[PDB]
Write an enzyme that holds these catalytic residues in place. Structure first.
Site, PDB file in Angstrom:
ATOM      1  N   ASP A 109       0.826  -1.196   0.000  1.00 53.79           N
ATOM      2  CA  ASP A 109       0.000   0.000   0.000  1.00 53.79           C
ATOM      3  C   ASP A 109       0.868   1.256   0.000  1.00 53.79           C
ATOM      4  O   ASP A 109       2.070   1.218   0.274  1.00 53.79           O
ATOM      5  CB  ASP A 109      -0.929   0.001   1.214  1.00 53.79           C
TER       6      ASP A 109
HETATM    7  C1  LIG Z   1      -0.332  12.893  18.079  1.00 51.43           C
HETATM    8  C2  LIG Z   1      -1.067  13.522  16.899  1.00 51.43           C
HETATM    9  C3  LIG Z   1      -2.101  12.579  16.292  1.00 51.43           C
HETATM   10  C4  LIG Z   1      -2.710  13.142  15.012  1.00 51.43           C
HETATM   11  C5  LIG Z   1      -3.807  12.247  14.440  1.00 51.43           C
HETATM   12  C6  LIG Z   1      -4.315  12.759  13.095  1.00 51.43           C
HETATM   13  C7  LIG Z   1      -5.712  12.245  12.757  1.00 51.43           C
HETATM   14  C8  LIG Z   1      -5.743  10.738  12.524  1.00 51.43           C
HETATM   15  C9  LIG Z   1      -7.035  10.295  11.840  1.00 51.43           C
HETATM   16  C10 LIG Z   1      -7.064  10.672  10.362  1.00 51.43           C
HETATM   17  C11 LIG Z   1      -8.384  10.299   9.693  1.00 51.43           C
HETATM   18  C12 LIG Z   1      -8.202   9.950   8.218  1.00 51.43           C
HETATM   19  O1  LIG Z   1      -7.641   8.954   7.912  1.00 51.43           O
HETATM   20  S1  LIG Z   1      -8.846  11.051   6.927  1.00 51.43           S
HETATM   21  C13 LIG Z   1      -9.243  10.056   5.461  1.00 51.43           C
HETATM   22  C14 LIG Z   1      -9.013  10.885   4.200  1.00 51.43           C
HETATM   23  N1  LIG Z   1      -9.777  10.359   3.083  1.00 51.43           N
HETATM   24  C15 LIG Z   1      -9.346   9.141   2.419  1.00 51.43           C
HETATM   25  O2  LIG Z   1      -8.373   8.577   2.786  1.00 51.43           O
HETATM   26  C16 LIG Z   1     -10.138   8.583   1.241  1.00 51.43           C
HETATM   27  C17 LIG Z   1      -9.345   7.782   0.214  1.00 51.43           C
HETATM   28  N2  LIG Z   1      -7.958   7.723   0.635  1.00 51.43           N
HETATM   29  C18 LIG Z   1      -6.909   7.455  -0.329  1.00 51.43           C
HETATM   30  O3  LIG Z   1      -7.183   7.290  -1.469  1.00 51.43           O
HETATM   31  C19 LIG Z   1      -5.451   7.398   0.124  1.00 51.43           C
HETATM   32  O4  LIG Z   1      -4.619   7.436  -1.002  1.00 51.43           O
HETATM   33  C20 LIG Z   1      -5.169   6.121   0.915  1.00 51.43           C
HETATM   34  C21 LIG Z   1      -6.118   5.005   0.485  1.00 51.43           C
HETATM   35  C22 LIG Z   1      -5.341   6.394   2.406  1.00 51.43           C
HETATM   36  C23 LIG Z   1      -3.738   5.675   0.633  1.00 51.43           C
HETATM   37  O5  LIG Z   1      -3.666   5.354  -0.726  1.00 51.43           O
HETATM   38  P1  LIG Z   1      -2.303   4.638  -1.308  1.00 51.43           P
HETATM   39  O6  LIG Z   1      -1.332   4.398  -0.177  1.00 51.43           O
HETATM   40  O7  LIG Z   1      -2.664   3.320  -1.949  1.00 51.43           O
HETATM   41  O8  LIG Z   1      -1.670   5.537  -2.342  1.00 51.43           O
END
Ligand SMILES: CCCCCCCCCCCC(=O)SCCNC(=O)CCNC(=O)[C@H](O)C(C)(C)COP(=O)(O)O
Ligand SMILES: CCCCCCCCCCCCCCCCCC(=O)OC[C@H](COP(=O)([O-])OCC(O)COP(=O)([O-])OC[C@@H](COC(=O)CCCCCCCCCCCCCCCCC)OC(=O)CCCCCCCCCCCCCCCCC)OC(=O)CCCCCCCCCCCCCCCCC
Ligand SMILES: CCCCCCCCCCCCCCCCCC(=O)OC[C@H](COP(=O)([O-])OCC(O)COP(=O)([O-])OC[C@@H](COC(=O)CCCCCCCCCCCCCCCCC)OC(=O)CCCCCCCCCCCCCCCCC)OC(=O)CCCCCCCCCCCCCCCCC
Ligand SMILES: CCCCCCCCCCCCCCCCC[C@@H](O)O[C@H](CO[C@H](O)CCCCCCCCCCCCCCC)COP(=O)(O)OCC[N+](C)(C)C
Ligand SMILES: CCCCCCCCCCCCCCCCC[C@@H](O)O[C@H](CO[C@H](O)CCCCCCCCCCCCCCC)COP(=O)(O)OCC[N+](C)(C)C
Ligand SMILES: CCCCCCCC/C=C\CCCCCCCC(=O)OC[C@H](COP(=O)(O)OCCN)OC(=O)CCCCCCC/C=C\CCCCCCCC
Ligand SMILES: CCCCCCCC/C=C\CCCCCCCC(=O)O[C@H](COC(=O)CCCCCCC/C=C/CCCCCCCC)COP(=O)(O)OCCN
Lengths: 88, 55, 128, 70, 55, 103, 178, 124, 84, 459
Positions: free
Chosen positions: A43
């Site tokens: 991934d």
């Molecule tokens: C101590 C501080 C802590 C901070 C925490 C920050 C917050 C954590 C929670 C974040 C919530 C989320 O994930 S926000 C989610 C954002 N939206 C998406 O992920 C929709 C589709 N995602 C993709 O397509 C990407 O590429 C992906 C499949 C991920 C990779 O793909 P590859 O690799 O194949 O390239």
């Protein structure tokens, strides 16, 4: 300082050592020309994880714009050698 | 041993009417005690730096 | 929820928290493309003038000359006497002078009066 | 000036006996000095003179008259 | 009975029984406590746990 | 994502040229050529040319030039206790008044 | 640093950069290795639960409160590598990087030493002199009308050709010249 | 500490303050009124030039300690008997100062009791 | 004279999670149904001479045994010499 | 004193009959010899003066300025040798003639036992300077700078002539000795107030005072190197010398008439020091630093206490030397860079180490570091102004802090940091520039050993 002059085959050995301990991929199938997205089914998040693993183990950190376009151990070795100015 | 105390005014720099400025050293308890400590610390630091910054 | 980050003049809004690039429209992409195009044009011109083996001088940068001219030699011709400028000039160029004059005048009058009445104890004040 | 020490790569570094014995000797010297000084002089740490209690002092030596003379 | 004892201990005793501000007393005591605390932090985080430096 | 073929080719060629230049940066055994031309003992001479001579110069300067002028060198008068005798006069300082000594 | 940038970052790029920053600051918070691994796996779990979302409006709604959460717990003193733009030895050796062209001003007595090095330098200078004249024509004939759209340069296509604008990139003081 | 808490939480006039003490005549307590004795004269204390704050009633032991330290120089811990005597006499002086403080406190107590009794008798 | 000896890397089969406190991490991850891919990568931090750690107090009194022995010997010698 | 004036005059037939390729050598050698001869004037006595004749007299205030003026010419010739390489023989000889005439006029000005002769020569020193600025100037703004420099000076100096002739008509003599011995108090009247203003403003415009300083940045920026040094080193000190000479007749009017000028200077030092911080040009920065130092000197002269006078003389000498050195260094940087901008060339310490050392030494001296005579004059003026009023210390300390800040900023911006990549014509520094800097700096560290030579007549 007393830092040994690290060389390309030493760098390649370090890359292969780090990769072979990443259990998500089988050490037998991996090759220094092997890809990541296709030849190993990894991934994008996994690729970021290997990039950070090399970051931690080599003591120098790679910028994001250059790290996201590394997909083979050979080009990782090439990038590290270019950064650290290795002759042979 | 004794409590010797001394100030040395060797070179007379300049006189401004009723004020006299001369190169005067005070060798009181504070000075005679702080010279060896500072010199010892500087000696140790220089020996350490002979290794720390060889490159 | 979490406490909000309130930006200030000396602590600006971070790029990640900024919402301009989260409202994405095709015209925004066109603007970014044009910005990258002009930046790349300038970079290409600089690199062409930079790697030339024949050049043995300093690359004259029009932006630096323009900045220097604007800062130094282009202030008066664009200046106009307006209530804001006139008031600011009068204040910042007159107020400090009169303030310091008043302070020193009062101090010296107090000292001079104390000299007349005699309770100053000017002993050993030989140098002056 | 020193001896040749090579890297290890995920193993414990080589340790010469000289630095180990010197460190142990100096730590032992410090602890021996502390114990000796404490044993010889306990006064610096705990005081050498008892603190008088002001409540026990009788009114005679303080010149207090029983509320009637003066 | 170390080098810092002969100075710091006497400093604390002299500060404790002079006609001084009480807030200065409290801040000095808290400061020496925090001094011990950060010495502990240095030792614990630099010499106790498992290694964390590059391989 | 990843390298474009043009990017890969350019990086490979630049890397080859960079490695060639870096190898060219080396020094041959004969590369540093120095044209020669001339016109306890170490500590023994060190203590002579660095300690003894300054001591001599400073002592001469202080003892026949500095003290020639008045008040240039003034020393705190030594402490006098009951019981000592003075070199200059020979008189003896009277002792204390036998304070009561218990514990 | 090496690679030219694009006009904008895609959503995947933003997600990956946020993931890397969050993992870095989490590692900064959890000093020890086992705690870091445990909470990094937990972070990956809470990160990939929205991997398969389809609508970009909700995905953009996400990664916005995520940025705020990251900024709230960002460990105001993160760990920075010594050579990083925030490290303790960021520009430490920048005072030793002497440009190559300075060697053109050396006195002949100084050039008497290291003669083979200067011979190789002359060879390199001649190579650059020819390569530049080839590169200017190649770049002129390859660029599209109206000026370049991105700062990406093409490689060498012929046999004797060399990549355009390689002199500055090829010769550098070093990573640690002294 | 307890005296500070007592003064800043109880009644201020109940017990004295270090600035204004003593407030009562020395002869109030007992009429014999023995006088403190000093065994070191002005001239020899000046010659020893101890300090301005060190020229107190405890000066003789300090002079003896200085004489010892000057005499047996190389053995820096040669004599401690006179050192211990100097600390013992300083401790005695501190005891006398605490005696002054407690005497002032109790005398102020008795004065307050007398005033209260007189006021009650006048009212009654 | 520099460090040129052609160091050999160890084998990658040596590092195992067993015998390290990574078991607790792995078990608590499996309880919620995940695993750590990089678990073995740091096993070297708990494997070799770094396995045994010293408590802060134990680190503080580094040389109590030798110092106490020397102190006891010195006190005994002083007692048996002054009593003369 | 003709033993100094006559060789300076002979310098002209010497330089005009010299060979086409040997003018610089002859001029430099004989000007250094003239300086060696003029060194003898330093032997002053605690009594009145060295009254040579009815026309020239030398005090212990005129002696240091005369020595500095005689010593400046060799450095002027060595600095001007660079940019005049492609110049015809006649124009180079004319340039050297103008420099020699300027030196002669300054030498005749500084002694000038009579005040009208002093005024005549102190206005005559204006023609060669204007010609040098307007003719051998690089930028196109040299004409406006020359006009400003001429008119700002002349507007102030014209009423001085009327005041001097009126003083001659009433008192009966303008000889300085008779003026000092026969001085009488000036009553508080409008006529006396305007006499004071006429006698003072002519010298105050030249230092210059804050609010009349607009000509100095233009004249210093637009002038060539030699013009810049002669402006910053000696031509500014003319106002100070003139005022310290003439204020002997303005008492006791001066005690209450110094307030506006005192306040203007004590605020303008802060204003110009702050201006130095946000500057995009070098020569402008040095010009504003000179303005600040001259404002401090104005304050010292207006205080009118012996320590004020001693500190003022020391500060004048020290500032002249330091400003000349700073302008030299800026000119050497500009010759290679050809741009005259602070941030275009950076990190030059890695390329030119010895010039970086000279930059550091010049910045330290300008920073008023002990025990250099800069700090001697500074501290004397500080103590005198503190005796005047205890609140001056706030302004003086603020000025000191800002002075250190802008000096170190100027050093760091042009010496520290990473070198600019696109500049590859930074040739190694010649022997001429290094010798010039050494000859600028060594006299300062030598004079710090014998301060009494530059402390003025009230020592
Ligand atoms: C101590 C501080 C802590 C901070 C925490 C920050 C917050 C954590 C929670 C974040 C919530 C989320 O994930 S926000 C989610 C954002 N939206 C998406 O992920 C929709 C589709 N995602 C993709 O397509 C990407 O590429 C992906 C499949 C991920 C990779 O793909 P590859 O690799 O194949 O390239
Ligand atoms: C020595 C060391 C350093 C010191 C030197 C430096 C500092 C000292 C010198 C510099 C400072 C001196 C400035 C004072 C005089 C300069 C003003 C000037 O020349 O007018 C030009 C200019 C010529 O008029 P205009 O070009 O036809 O009209 C342009 C405006 O848009 C039209 O404006 P408007 O119509 O919108 O409004 C004008 C009106 C409005 O008034 C205001 O808005 C605020 C009130 C300001 C003054 C009242 C208090 O003003 C008045 O009616 C006030 C009359 C009394 O007039 C102005 O713009 C300024 C008007 C305001 C006067 C302010 C003066 C007060 C300063 C304190 C004394
Ligand atoms: C501390 C006393 C020393 C006594 C020994 C005698 C020293 C005589 C020196 C006479 C003046 C120096 C000549 C100036 C130009 C230097 C020539 C040069 O280009 O260097 C290349 C040369 C060879 O190096 P290179 O590798 O070929 O060139 C590579 C680059 O140059 C790369 O250059 P770099 O990285 O090697 O750096 C150059 C270096 C050298 O360049 C300089 O910066 C030297 C100028 C420093 C003065 C700064 C102005 C402040 C006003 C001070 C006025 C005092 C003068 C007294 C009379 C002086 C007589 C000439 O700069 C520094 O190290 C920093 C200087 C900052 C020192 C701050 C302390 C000042 C006050 C100290 C107390 C003064 C009064 C004491 C009264 C009570 C005690 C008796 O290096 C030297 O020659 C170094 C000379 C020694 C440094 C002297 C610094 C302090 C001494 C000041 C005067 C001594 C007072 C009398 C005390 C007697 C006891
Ligand atoms: C061991 C010695 C250690 C110290 C050495 C000190 C060196 C001092 C030399 C430098 C002198 C400084 C210049 C001061 C000269 C000005 C004074 C001049 O006006 O005096 C003239 C006289 O000066 C001398 O005669 C000549 C001085 C010029 C020569 C200087 C010596 C060094 C110059 C070398 C320059 C070139 C060297 C070689 C180049 C290749 C005439 O004065 P006058 O009004 O009648 O006196 C009347 C009183 N009488 C009757 C008693 C005579
Ligand atoms: C702008 C850059 C700097 C330029 C130079 C600035 C310095 C020049 C400013 C003049 C300084 C002061 C001049 C007069 C000082 C005397 C004190 C007097 O002004 O105050 C009162 C005087 O009252 C009024 O001030 C009268 C004068 C009012 C008219 C003068 C113009 C005021 C504003 C103009 C400022 C313009 C200056 C710049 C011109 C270009 C005292 O009343 P009184 O005790 O009874 O009279 C004293 C004189 N006696 C004793 C001989 C009788
Ligand atoms: C050096 C090599 C030669 C060594 C052999 C000679 C040994 C010493 C014998 C020399 C004779 C003594 C001598 O030199 O004369 C004294 C002579 C001055 O003469 P005076 O009359 O006493 O004072 C001046 C007013 N008339 O003293 C000296 O100059 C020599 C020693 C002075 C100190 C050395 C310089 C150190 C300070 C440098 C200046 C720093 C700035 C000023 C400091 C500020 C202090 C407020
Ligand atoms: C950079 C620009 C600076 C401008 C400087 C110019 C202003 C200088 C101040 C005024 C100069 C003229 C003064 C006159 C010359 C002095 C002679 C003198 O003092 O004689 C007086 C005469 O005094 C005068 O006549 C003065 C008249 C002034 C008229 C011209 C006015 C010019 C402007 C004045 C106001 C500005 C002052 C401050 C200027 C600040 C700088 C801008 C005595 O008169 P008696 O006839 O002898 O009387 C005795 C019997 N009762």
């Amino acid at each position: 300082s007393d830092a040994p002059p690290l060389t390309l085959e030493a760098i390649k050995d370090r890359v292969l050592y780090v990769l072979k301990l990443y259990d998500k991929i089988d050490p037998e199938k991996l090759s220094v020309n092997s890809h990541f997205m296709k030849d190993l089914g990894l991934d994008s998040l996994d690729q970021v994880e290997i990039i950070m693993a090399m970051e931690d183990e080599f003591g120098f950190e790679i910028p994001d714009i250059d790290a996201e376009k590394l997909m083979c151990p050979q080009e990782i070795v090439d990038y590290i050698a270019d950064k650290k100015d290795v002759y042979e | 041993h004794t409590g010797q105390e001394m100030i040395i005014s060797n070179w007379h720099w300049m006189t401004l009417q009723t004020v006299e400025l001369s190169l005067s050293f005070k060798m009181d308890y504070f000075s005679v005690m702080f010279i060896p400590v500072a010199l010892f610390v500087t000696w140790s630091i220089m020996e350490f730096s002979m290794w720390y910054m060889h490159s | 929820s979490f406490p909000k980050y309130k930006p200030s003049r000396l602590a600006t809004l971070p790029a990640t928290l900024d919402p301009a690039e989260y409202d994405i429209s095709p015209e925004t992409r066109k603007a970014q493309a044009e910005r990258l195009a002009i930046r790349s044009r300038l970079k290409r011109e600089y690199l062409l003038q930079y790697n030339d083996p024949n050049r043995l001088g300093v690359i004259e940068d029009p932006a630096l000359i323009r900045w220097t001219y604007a800062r130094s030699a282009n202030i008066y011709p664009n200046f106009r006497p307006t209530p804001k400028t006139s008031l600011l000039g009068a204040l910042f160029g007159i107020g400090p002078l009169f303030f310091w004059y008043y302070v020193f005048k009062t101090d010296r009058d107090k000292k001079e009066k104390l000299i007349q009445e005699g309770k100053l104890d000017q002993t050993f004040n030989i140098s002056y | 000036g020193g001896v040749h020490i090579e890297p290890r790569y995920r193993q414990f570094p080589q340790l010469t006996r000289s630095q180990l014995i010197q460190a142990e000797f100096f730590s032992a010297t410090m602890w021996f000095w502390i114990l000796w000084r404490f044993w010889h002089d306990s006064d610096a740490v705990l005081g050498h003179f008892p603190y008088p209690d002001p409540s026990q002092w009788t009114d005679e030596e303080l010149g207090i008259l029983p509320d009637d003379e003066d | 009975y170390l080098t810092g004892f002969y100075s710091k201990d006497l400093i604390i005793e002299a500060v404790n029984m002079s006609y001084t501000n009480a807030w200065a007393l409290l801040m000095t005591l808290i400061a020496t406590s925090l001094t011990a605390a950060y010495s502990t932090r240095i030792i614990f985080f630099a010499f106790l746990g498992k290694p964390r430096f590059p391989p | 994502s990843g390298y474009t073929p043009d990017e890969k080719l350019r990086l490979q060629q630049l890397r080859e040229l960079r490695r060639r230049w870096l190898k060219d940066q080396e020094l041959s055994p004969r590369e540093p050529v120095l044209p020669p031309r001339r016109v306890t003992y170490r500590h023994s001479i060190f203590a002579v040319t660095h300690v003894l001579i300054p001591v001599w110069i400073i002592h001469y300067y202080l003892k026949y030039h500095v003290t020639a002028k008045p008040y240039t060198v003034v020393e705190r008068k030594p402490r006098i206790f009951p019981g000592d005798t003075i070199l200059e006069t020979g008189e003896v300082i009277p002792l204390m008044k036998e304070f009561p000594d218990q514990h | 640093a090496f690679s030219a940038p694009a006009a904008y970052l895609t959503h995947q790029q933003k997600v990956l950069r946020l993931y890397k920053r969050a993992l870095r600051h989490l590692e900064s918070w959890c000093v020890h290795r086992d705690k870091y691994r445990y909470f990094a796996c937990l972070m990956r779990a809470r990160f990939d639960e929205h991997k398969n979302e389809k609508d970009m409006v909700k995905a953009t709604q996400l990664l916005r409160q995520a940025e705020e959460e990251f900024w709230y717990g960002q460990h105001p003193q993160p760990y920075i590598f010594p050579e990083s733009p925030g490290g303790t030895s960021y520009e430490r050796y920048e005072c030793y990087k002497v440009p190559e062209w300075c060697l053109d001003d050396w006195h002949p007595s100084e050039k008497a030493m290291y003669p083979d090095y200067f011979a190789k330098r002359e060879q390199w200078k001649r190579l650059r002199r020819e390569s530049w004249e080839r590169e200017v024509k190649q770049l002129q004939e390859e660029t599209p009308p109206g000026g370049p759209r991105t700062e990406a340069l093409p490689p060498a296509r012929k046999e004797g050709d060399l990549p355009p604008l390689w002199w500055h990139i090829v010769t550098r003081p070093r990573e640690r010249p002294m | 500490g307890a005296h500070l808490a007592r003064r800043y939480l109880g009644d201020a006039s109940k017990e004295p303050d270090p600035l204004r003490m003593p407030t009562f005549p020395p002869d109030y307590g007992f009429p014999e009124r023995k006088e403190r004795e000093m065994v070191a004269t002005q001239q020899e204390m000046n010659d020893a030039q101890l300090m301005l704050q060190q020229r107190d009633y405890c000066a003789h032991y300090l002079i003896q300690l200085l004489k010892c330290k000057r005499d047996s120089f190389p053995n820096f811990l040669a004599c401690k008997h006179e050192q211990h005597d100097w600390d013992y006499c300083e401790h005695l002086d501190y005891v006398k100062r605490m005696k002054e403080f407690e005497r002032e406190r109790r005398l102020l107590q008795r004065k307050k009791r007398r005033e209260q009794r007189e006021a009650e008798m006048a009212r009654g | 004279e520099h460090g040129h000896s052609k160091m050999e890397l160890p084998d990658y089969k040596q590092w195992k999670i067993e015998g390290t406190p990574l078991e607790t991490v792995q078990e608590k991850l499996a309880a919620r149904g995940l695993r750590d891919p990089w678990g073995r990568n740091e096993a070297w931090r708990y494997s070799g001479g770094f396995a045994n750690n010293v408590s802060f107090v134990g680190a503080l009194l580094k040389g109590f045994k030798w110092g106490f022995a020397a102190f006891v010997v010195a006190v005994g010698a002083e007692y048996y010499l002054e009593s003369q | 004193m003709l033993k100094i004036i006559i060789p300076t005059t002979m310098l002209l037939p010497m330089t005009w009959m010299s060979k086409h390729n040997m003018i610089w050598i002859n001029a430099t050698v004989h000007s250094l010899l003239i300086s060696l001869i003029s060194l003898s004037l330093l032997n002053q006595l605690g009594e009145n003066s060295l009254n040579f004749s009815l026309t020239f007299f030398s005090d212990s205030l005129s002696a240091p300025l005369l020595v500095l003026t005689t010593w400046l010419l060799p450095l002027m010739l060595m600095a001007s040798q660079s940019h005049l390489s492609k110049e015809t023989t006649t124009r180079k000889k004319l340039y050297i003639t103008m420099l020699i005439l300027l030196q002669l006029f300054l030498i005749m000005t500084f002694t000038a036992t009579e005040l009208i002769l002093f005024y005549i020569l102190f206005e005559a020193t204006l023609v060669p300077t204007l010609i040098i600025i307007t003719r051998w100037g690089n930028q196109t703004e040299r004409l406006n700078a020359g006009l400003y420099f001429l008119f700002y000076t002349l507007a102030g100096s014209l009423p001085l002539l009327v005041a001097l002739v009126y003083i001659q008509n009433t008192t009966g003599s303008l000889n300085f000795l008779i003026i000092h011995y026969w001085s009488h108090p000036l009553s508080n009247s409008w006529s006396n107030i305007f006499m004071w203003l006429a006698c003072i403003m002519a010298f105050m415009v030249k230092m210059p005072l804050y609010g009349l300083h607009l000509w100095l940045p233009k004249a210093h920026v637009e002038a060539p190197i030699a013009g810049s040094m002669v402006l910053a080193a000696v031509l500014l000190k003319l106002g100070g010398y003139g005022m310290m000479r003439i204020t002997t007749i303005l008492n006791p009017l001066t005690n209450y008439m110094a307030y506006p000028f005192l306040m203007l200077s004590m605020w303008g030092m802060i204003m110009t020091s702050s201006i130095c911080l946000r500057q995009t040009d070098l020569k402008s920065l040095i010009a504003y630093s000179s303005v600040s130092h001259m404002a401090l000197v104005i304050v010292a002269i207006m205080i009118q206490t012996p320590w004020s006078f001693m500190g003022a003389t020391a500060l004048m000498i020290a500032h002249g030397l330091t400003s000349s050195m700073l302008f030299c260094l800026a000119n050497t940087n500009y010759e290679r860079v050809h741009s005259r901008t602070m941030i275009l060339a950076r990190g030059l310490q890695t390329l030119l180490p010895l010039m970086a050392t000279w930059w550091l030494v010049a910045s330290l001296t300008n920073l008023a570091l002990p025990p250099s005579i800069n700090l001697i004059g500074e501290l004397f003026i500080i103590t005198a102004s503190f005796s005047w009023s205890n609140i001056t210390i706030i302004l003086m300390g603020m000025n000191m802090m800002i002075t250190a800040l802008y000096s170190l900023y100027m050093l760091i911006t042009t010496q520290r940091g990473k070198y600019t990549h696109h500049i590859n014509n930074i040739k190694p520094s010649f022997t001429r520039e290094n010798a010039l800097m050494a000859l600028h700096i060594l006299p300062l560290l030598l004079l710090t050993l014998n301060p009494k030579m530059i402390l003025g007549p009230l020592y």
